[PDB]
Structure 1
Amino acid sequence: ATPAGPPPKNFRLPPPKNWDEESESTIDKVGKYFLMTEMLRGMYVLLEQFFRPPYTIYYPFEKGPISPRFRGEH
């Protein structure tokens, strides 16, 4: 599963950290749970799209781009 020869330098993972060894303040950790902050960020990204121009083409009045090499009817 690893190549022959010496194992990769630090291929083995570090030992797992216990819950109280983690570096995340309870205030930051508990706030992100109850306020649902990462879900709030994603909802904000959809507001950003809302106020951006759409990609839509009005067909059949506006056509999409075709190259000189296009392969249509004989």
Structure 2
Amino acid sequence: TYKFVNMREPSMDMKSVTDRAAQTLLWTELVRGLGMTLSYLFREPATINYPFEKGPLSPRFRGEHALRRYPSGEERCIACKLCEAVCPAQAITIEAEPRADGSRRTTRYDIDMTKCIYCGFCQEACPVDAIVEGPNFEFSTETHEELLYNKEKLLNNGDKWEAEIAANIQADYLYR
């Protein structure tokens, strides 16, 4: 089924022509638009008082990256390199070796924040949930160099945001 948007024919009787002439001469629709704007002024604005108020978010929100660890305190990452393989932008660089106790751990875990597209494929490819994309988004920088993260920066981010990250994962892990 289809509709016509502009298939009306104006009436040509004297009253209709006089109405259209009154519209032309007295600017009635212009006054209607003015009235719409005037009414729209007297309503409450939609502005929030940033940074004292914040926009709504979701537990699924993808922000700054972080490396998590187990409750015992050992890092969850096992250097499987699945996040590196899935990364659509090749933003992850990983190097690994056996630890002094024989554990399978990374020696290098770099993510380029300036090549990252913040898609979240890395955190969903991770088997042990080692890497997550946390809720932080206010991490703007004055130089390009500080946006090149190494393993220490990501581990520090994890230790910094672990409470909120764990709460969000608890809220959302039944959808994954």
TM-score (norm 2): 0.29
**1:14-46: CA deviations, max 9, x gaps?**
9xx7x9x63562321210001111111011001
Supply the RMSD in Å over aligned alpha carbons.
Answer: 2.3
Q: Measure the CA separation in 1 of the matches of 2:27 and 2:44.
A: 29
2:60 counterpart residue number? 69
Q: Measure the CA separation in 2 of the matches of 1:50 and 1:71.
A: 36
The structure carrying a bigger strand percent of its residues is 2
Matches within 5 A, 1:35-50: 35-50=26-41
| Mapped pair 1:59 → 2:84 | no
Which has the larger Rg?
2
Once the two structures are TM-superposed, the CA of residue 62 in structure 1 deviates from its matched residue by 0.2
**5+ residue gaps in structure 1?**
1-13
Write the letter of the residue equivalent to 1:68: P
Which structure is richer in relative contact order (CA contacts within 8 A, separation 6 or more)?
2
Write the letter of the residue equivalent to 2:20: K
Q: How many residues align?
A: 57
Q: Measure the CA separation in 1 of the matches of 2:62 and 2:17.
A: 62
Query: Kindly, what percent of the aligned residue pairs are identical?
Result: 49
| Mapped pair 1:26 → 2:21 | no
TM-score (norm 1): 0.66
